[PDB]
Amino acid sequence: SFLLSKVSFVIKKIRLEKGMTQEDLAYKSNLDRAYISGIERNSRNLTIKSLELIMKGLEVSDVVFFEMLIKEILK
Amino acid sequence: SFLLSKVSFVIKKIRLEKGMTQEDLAYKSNLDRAYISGIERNSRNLTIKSLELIMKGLEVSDVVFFEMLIKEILK
């Protein structure tokens, strides 16, 4: 999946910009660390709900996530 | 969920814009009509891969789907 790879890139990029570890994001979002880790490797076929939870744990607005996704796809 | 109802709304809006029924879309995408139906009710369980595949069947680029999603969130 091209789209799944761009999605995973942005999640990890925003996470690192916010200064959170995968373990911090796990506890925030109530997702397991291993699911987080797989998402960032492009190895979990993430649902929309899971994406919502991650954006919430990352404290990024949904518009900001989608804007950076569009930018990354356009590169 | 606000995000989930906006995602479902946009998939349905575009499918209607392209003049497809739920079944037209399913036949095009090798999915079932009941899956398309459930997605438009409740986008909880939609994955990134399924989303890519739906956009492909709708012949809407990824960048355009995310624009219409942002418009809807902001409206």
Residue numbers in the entry:
A (entry chain A), B (entry chain B): 3 to 77
Which of the paper's sentences describe this entry?
The most widespread of these mechanisms employs a “controller” (C) protein encoded by a gene downstream of its own promoter, and usually co-transcribed with the endonuclease (R) gene as a single transcriptional unit. The C-protein binds at various sites within the C/R promoter to regulate transcription of its own gene and the associated endonuclease gene. Unusually, in the RM system Esp1396I, the C-protein also represses the MTase (M) gene by binding to the promoter at the transcriptional start site, denoted OM where the C/R genes and the M gene are transcribed convergently from different promoters. Flexibility in this loop is very important for DNA sequence recognition, as it has been observed in the nucleoprotein structures to adopt different conformations depending on which operator site the protein is bound to.
The mutant protein R46A bound with a much lower affinity (∼16 nM), and T36A did not show any measurable binding under these conditions. An even more important role is indicated for T36, since the DNA binding ability of the T36A mutant was completely abolished, as measured by SPR. The ΔΔG for R46A is significantly larger (8.5 kJ mol−1), and that for the T36A mutation must be larger still, since we could not measure any DNA binding activity of this mutant protein. Both R46 and T36 of C.Esp1396I are seen in crystal structures of DNA-protein complexes to interact directly with the base pairs involved in sequence recognition, specifically with the G and C bases, respectively, of the C-box recognition sequence GTC. The T36A mutant structure was observed to adopt two loop conformations (I and III) in equal proportions, indicating the conformational flexibility in this region. T36 is not part of the flexible loop region; it is in fact near the N-terminal end of helix 3 and therefore the likelihood of a mutation at this position altering the loop conformation is minimal. The T36A mutant protein crystal structure showed both the major conformation (I) and the novel conformation observed in this study (III), indicating that both could exist simultaneously in different subunits of the protein dimer. Despite Y37F and T36A only crystallising in the presence of SO4, this anion was not visible in either electron density map. As with the high-resolution wild type structure, the C-terminal tail is also involved in several crystal contacts with multiple monomers in the T36A, Y37F and trigonal R46A structures.
